[PDB]
């Protein structure tokens, strides 16, 4: 049986179940459907009642998975989502469910081309320069991508700006500049 | 004599650095300009 691998990989049992579902969905073209239903079942399994029942280490595996079937089948679940649910339950991997979902979300965060990038500066920024910066660091991208800006503010860098886009990373802050000064003048 | 040439050179090289630290958004706009010329 041949599996199609997602363009980004997650590991651990979380990543294994995540890529299992990615292959299972890309083989019937239900990516967005199972993604939204995964987020919703994650919200369901975190309400205190079932979120507290799922991790009780004595409730029998058969009875737990049957009750979980009862609970999920009412939301009109497509077969793939409840299949993954029963596969996690009969394997005792329920406390990890949300994590898997989280992982799966990140997988879609690469299928849509979402490149997460950070621009950290000393003080908060106004959105005119922020928008022209979105334009600037959007110029790097190739054909067909979307970008997610998550800017934070730290005065410890005393100014400048740090652009960590995916793996690329430019350090234009005054701090690394003055460290360069110290190390170069001392040597 | 040369030792004093070193002792004062090594002190004057740190003072000037611990002095500029107290010293304008012109740098940030320059960074976006530097980023504009990144290509």
């Amino acid at each position: 049986a041949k599996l199609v691998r997602p363009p980004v990989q997650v590991y651990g049992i979380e990543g294994r179940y995540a890529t299992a579902l990615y292959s299972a969905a890309s083989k019937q073209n239900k990516l967005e459907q199972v993604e939204k239903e995964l987020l919703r079942v994650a919200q369901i399994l975190k309400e205190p009642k079932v979120a507290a029942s799922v991790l009780n280490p004595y409730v029998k595996r058969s009875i737990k998975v049957k009750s979980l079937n009862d609970i999920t089948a009412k939301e009109r679940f497509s077969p793939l989502t409840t299949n993954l649910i029963n596969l996690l339950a009969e394997n005792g991997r329920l406390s990890n469910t949300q994590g898997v979902v989280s992982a799966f979300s990140t997988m879609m965060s690469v299928h849509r081309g979402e490149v997460p990038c950070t621009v950290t500066s000393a003080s908060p920024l106004e959105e005119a320069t922020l928008s022209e910066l979105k334009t600037v660091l959007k110029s790097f991208l190739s054909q067909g991508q979307v970008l997610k800006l998550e800017a934070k503010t730290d005065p410890s860098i005393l100014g400048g700006m740090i652009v960590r886009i995916g793996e690329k990373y430019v350090d234009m802050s005054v701090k690394t500049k003055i460290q360069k000064l110290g190390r170069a003048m001392r040597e | 004599q040369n030792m004093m040439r070193r002792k004062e050179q090594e002190h004057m090289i740190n003072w000037v650095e611990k002095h500029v630290v107290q010293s304008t958004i012109a740098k940030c706009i320059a960074d976006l300009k530097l980023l504009a010329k990144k290509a």
Partner: peptide, 15 residues
């Protein structure tokens, strides 16, 4: 170039 003005000003201060 805050680095360069820093250098020149500290040179003028040390001199």
């Amino acid at each position: 170039q805050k680095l360069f003005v820093d250098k020149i000003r500290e040179y003028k201060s040390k001199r």
